[PDB]
Every structure is written in C-alpha cells, then in structure tokens.
Design a protein around this ligand. Structure first.
Ligand SMILES: Cc1nccn1CCO
Ligand SMILES: Cc1nccn1CCO
Ligand SMILES: Cc1nccn1CCO
Ligand SMILES: [Mg+2]
Ligand SMILES: [Mg+2]
Ligand SMILES: [Mg+2]
Ligand SMILES: [Mg+2]
Lengths: 262, 250, 255
C-alpha cells in the first residue's frame, strides 16, 4: 500500500472527462481514496488545469458529437502538458461510431494507460488491421489480448474481468480479487479508470506497481465490502464500497491481495 | 414473476435516452433486476445498437435544444428497427416548450408505452380520474398507457387495471418514476405491442420492491431507502411477489 | 426551525441549473427537506417555469461553451421574473475561463446570494479597489451588494447590516462530492421568492444542512463517506426543532 498512502497525503488533482452515467460515483470514489477529482470538460480551461493536475481520465461511455472534437483537443493539450492519460474505450465493440473515434484518438495522442474489458480491447486491436496471423474469432484469452495490444500501442494495458490482467513493458501480471457485485453497480469499471488515474502522479509511463496497486485497492475493497454484514445486495454495496476504500489499510491489503506473474 | 425470470437470465439490452438527474439510478435499477442498461444518446450509433437491443426508453426530463432533433431521429430509427419505445413525457404540463415537443414526437413515431403521472398524461391529451384519462389517451394514441399515482393504472387494448402497491418514500427519491420507465422498458423483450401482463409485472415488481424496502429495519428515510430498493429488486422472489401484489381489473 | 417547516408544507419549486456531477444529489437533498427540485436548463421554458418557481440555483461546476450563453439568458429571465438567484461560482479561482465568466454573469444580472468557499469568493473580488473569511465576505458584500455565504470550517454569512459565523458540520462532508453544491440548492430552497432574503433564512438553511451532517456522522451506521451520504439525506428528512435548537452553534455576530 505504498502509493495509496501518498494519494491520501497529497490529494492529487485528477481530471475526469467521463461519461454522464458515472460522474458522481467516479468523483466520490476518487474522494474516498483521498484524491481530488475535477470533471472539467471545457477545452478553454484545460491548459490551466492540466499544468497543476496529476492525471486525466478520458472515458467515452456516452460519447456524442458534443464531445468528439473537444476530447481530441484536450488529449493533445494533456500530451503537451505532460499530463498522463488513462483511456477507457467503453463499449468500443458495439459501434463503428465508437471504433472510428477510438482509432482517431489513439492516432492523435499518446495515452499512458488503456483500460477495458476483453471484448473492448479485442475490438480496438482487431480494428487496427495490424494483427496479421491472428484469428480473432478464435477464443483469445485476456493475457494474449493484452500483450497484443501492448505491442500495438506501447502503452500499459489493463484488461478487467473475473481475473484482471496488466501489461506494462515486458511484465504481465494477473490479479484475482473482487466481487461479482461490482458488475451490478453501474459506475464500477468507470470508477476504476479514475482510480488508476489517481495512482499516476504525473508519470506518463507508470510503474507497473502503481497499476497493480490501483486495481488491487479497488478489487480488495470490493471483496471486503461484499463480506460486510450490512451488505444486502448491489444497492447497499455501493456505499459500503466507498467506505471500504476510505478505510482500507495495509494489513487488509497484504492479507487479501491475489497476484500471479505471467 | 414470469417475465422477471427472463430478464434475470437473458440480460436484455435496454437503451435509455433519459434525463441528466436520473441516469445513474436508472442504470442501477436496471442492473438490479438483471437487465443491461446503455445510455446511448448519439444518433450515429443508434442503428447498430438498436438492432441488438430489446427496448428504448425516451425520457424528456431535462429536454434542451441539444436533445430535440436527436430524440426525433432516434425514435424514427427505433421504429425502423422494430425496437419498442417507452416514452416518459416528464413535466409536459409545465411548459409549452415541452408540450410542443411531445406533440412533435408522437406525430413522428409510434411508441409502445406512454408512462406518466395523471397531470402529464392529461396535458398530453388536452393541449378526471386516472382511469378515465388513461382510456382517453389510449383512444388517441392506440398505445399502452401507464399512469402512476397513489394507485397506478395500466390500459392496453380493451383492458384496464389498477395496482395498489408501493411506498410514500418513492416520492422523495428523485427519479423513482424515471427508473420505473426504464424497468418497463426492461420487460418489453422487443414486443412493440406488449402484453398487459408484462406491464403489470414491471410496475408490480417495482412497487412491491418499494413496499418491502420501506419495511426494512435499516430504512431510516429516503436516503437509506434508495440503496435498499435496489437490494430488494435484486432479491425479489415469487413468493413475496404473489403474497404482496394488489391488483384490480376495472 | 421556522422556514424549514414552511418548506415541508409548501413544497417550493426550486429550479437548479447545476453541474453534471451533483444533479441527482442536489435533487435528492431538496426532496429530503420537502422542496420540489426541477433541473430545467432550457432557456425556452424559463419564462414559464420561473413565474411559478421560488428560486433559481446557478452552479458553474461543469461550465462549458454549451452553458455560457444559456446561463446568461436564464439569469436575465430570472431577474425579469423577480426570481431570486443563488450563484455558486465553483472553482472560479482555478481558471481565467471561469473568472471571466463569473465577471460577465455578475455584470449582466443581479443575484440574491453568492455562495462559495473563501478561495472562490476571494477570486471573485481579486481585481478590485482592495485574509479571514469575515473580511472577504464583507468586501464581497461591498462590491456586489448581495448576501454572501462563505463556507469553510466555520461558515460566514453577510447580509444587510449583519455578519454571522456558524460552527456546525462534519469532516465527512468534504468527502462527499457536491456537498457544497447541494448546500447552494438548500439555500435556494429557503428563499421563498425573496430577492433580498432575510439573514435568518440563510442562517437556517446553512444550519439545517450542517446540523444534519453532524447528526448523520454520529449515527452508529455511519461507516464512512459512502454510508454517510444516505444518512445525511435521512437526517435532513427527519430534522426536528428540538435537535436544531440544541445543536446550532452561532459563534459571532457583528452589527
Ligand atoms: C468534482 C467536480 N467536478 C466538477 C464539479 N464537481 C463537483 C463539485 O466539486
Ligand atoms: C449504463 C451506461 N451507459 C453508458 C455508460 N454507462 C455506464 C457504464 O459503462
Ligand atoms: C428533478 C428533475 N428535474 C428534471 C428531471 N428531474 C428528475 C425527475 O423528476
Ligand atoms: Mg467498463
Ligand atoms: Mg413521468
Ligand atoms: Mg422514464
Ligand atoms: Mg463548493
């Protein structure tokens, strides 16, 4: 629990350009770990905000025409500022609109972490038309998808699922913490993207240990919240998750973390 | 509890074009019953999304110029795709801006359910019990009508039913009624003329869950009620449903 | 607890033009005290809504080009309707974009209450004839001739010939996004269409909110910022005069 202590003490300003369903929950989850969220979407204030921020999250869950040019512009402003970007290509596999936009974004800017579920990351890389020799209709595992994506974008890849996978440089790790109740809370994965942004501390090429810790804090909090005697389902789980992020300590972290290399 | 079982197993993709105050809660409510919510507002992806979706909710609670043309366009896309529309004309009686828009929408697309409170549905058909209003509206639009109130009324074809479940705490949670629109969408399974039994089950699941949540020892008011509602939707079983449902045919 | 009884009985329509992170919580908080929130942002319906509303909140937390001109237009519609405006210049000190906009709004329209933290209000008054919150609030009052509410560890209100300091609340409030945003809404709920509100209304609004927060954080089921938020809403819903009078902490009153 190294980096979480620093979040709690430093209160990193974490800019979130995220979807309209999850803004409150993402901001609350960032506040619970001690970060300082700001949902700023105006390009007119990006240069000022970004100079003093520690990371930017771009999540395209409710992407519309209102957002497209602005997201590209701020991504470029983040690059120029040296502000690391976490990119969550929500539902990219569901439409050509989203596929085209994500391709455009990742041709326009260097991001620092790309985070999605297996189907999202597979759709990204399938659309690239680069993966000569790979059958995409075959049942590719998340580790394989993550390493292929890493080869394409040379950017840390985080694939969420029953087990989570992180690939950064030549290290790949698999994490096995969490709760099924997380899929039953709409902001959960989207919040994770914001939590990962919270752990970056302005590092454009984050250490894999930061990413391991971000994902593990979230998932272990979830596991603990779901065990709480007052957790009665996905509704009461959400407040308990935030409480459990707020209170998570090193002892619980170390006792619960389930990680495997390769 | 027939249709709920199907939602739980089949995880129906339910598209929601809804208001800015209730997106999260609507999504969460749909997740608690097993549905798969998607708050897609871009007309550019409607054709692709709608081909695989089971229903569309259109709720105009926070209608602005940004939304107007897009809502008309997606309603037409839904019609073309055979995707049933649930329409919630939130606060239509409060402004000529809303009244004009709702009139334009209902001249531009066939919807599958129109849901509102008595004043909303009255405003639609005007510009007085709920049963009478609902039947008049049904005559005009030839679409299922759900009027929420102390008692809820459903009219579909030549059948009208009154349901008497719920809690007073629902009125103190913003977007309770908005979420009920989404739950109704979740029960449609791509039927553009839904069975009245599906509509009865959608409203009853919601209002029985509300009743039961408000009886929970840990319900201390409208704040704690909302998490408990979601828990209760997640846990609702047939035994509770059948013991608690209060329905009368008109 | 005079005004709160009235809000519970009369159910004042309270229009909120507020930021995207806090809409749901703001509406729920207004519902909890018995107000009727409406998050109407369309200028096309402002004249009709405002004739029957009791107040308007304008909060610029998520200000973008989409909002700028609409906010100016609706503020003018409110002024023409006699509808009091509560203005929350969220993070105005953080960008020239927000500073310039707040300067434009306040030139264009008269508001009834300006609510912010000390850094926000200080940023508003920064380019003027020219440290503690009371001093900042009095300077702002001299410039805008409008009630000023400065939130902080202790809250300050200045209106008319009086300045007061209040000392209620919980540290868990800072860990709930939009607690302060919801407070702006609660203040709007206490206005009852008075464009020059009585300081007693403002004191009651802030005190109801912060006393509820204190009480909710003492609840045995409050385990952190997540469970606190539901309990805050429950405690606003149930707050009574006895608790109010026993807990209110008014620290200083000047003039
Ligand atoms: C976290 C945030 N970003 C924009 C507005 N908000 C809520 C007020 O802090
Ligand atoms: C339910 C929904 N629609 C667009 C975004 N979201 C939140 C979860 O991705
Ligand atoms: C509170 C409000 N303003 C616009 C929509 N909503 C939520 C449904 O009442
Ligand atoms: Mg996701
Ligand atoms: Mg309605
Ligand atoms: Mg609805
Ligand atoms: Mg504030």
């Amino acid at each position: 629990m190294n980096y979480l202590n620093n979040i709690r003490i430093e209160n990193p300003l974490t800019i979130c350009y995220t979807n309209d369903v999850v803004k409150n929950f993402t901001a609350n989850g960032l506040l619970s770990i001690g970060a300082s969220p700001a949902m700023s979407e105006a390009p007119e204030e990006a240069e000022e905000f970004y100079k003093v921020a520690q990371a930017l999250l771009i999540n395209i869950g409710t992407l519309t025409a209102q957002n497209e040019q602005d997201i590209i512009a701020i991504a470029q402003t983040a690059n120029e500022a040296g502000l690391p970007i976490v990119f969550d290509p929500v539902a990219v596999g569901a439409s050509t609109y989203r596929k085209q936009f994500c391709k455009l974004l990742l041709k326009s800017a260097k991001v620092s972490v790309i985070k999605g579920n297996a189907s999202e990351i597979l759709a990204l890389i399938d659309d690239t038309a680069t993966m000569k020799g790979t059958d995409s209709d075959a049942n590719l595992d998340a580790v394989t998808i993550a390493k292929k994506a890493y080869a394409i974008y040379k950017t840390a890849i985080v694939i969420t699922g029953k087990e989570d996978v992180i690939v950064q440089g030549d290290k790949a790790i698999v994490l096995a913490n969490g709760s099924p109740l997380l899929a039953r809370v709409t902001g959960a994965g989207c919040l994770l993207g914001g939590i990962i942004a919270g752990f970056l501390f302005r590092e454009t090429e984050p250490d894999i240990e930061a990413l391991i810790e971000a994902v593990s804090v979230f998932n272990i909090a979830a596991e603990v919240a779901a065990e709480n005697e007052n957790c009665g389902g996905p509704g009461t789980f959400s407040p308990l998750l935030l409480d459990t992020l707020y209170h998570l300590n090193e002892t619980t972290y170390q006792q619960r973390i389930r990680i495997q290399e390769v």
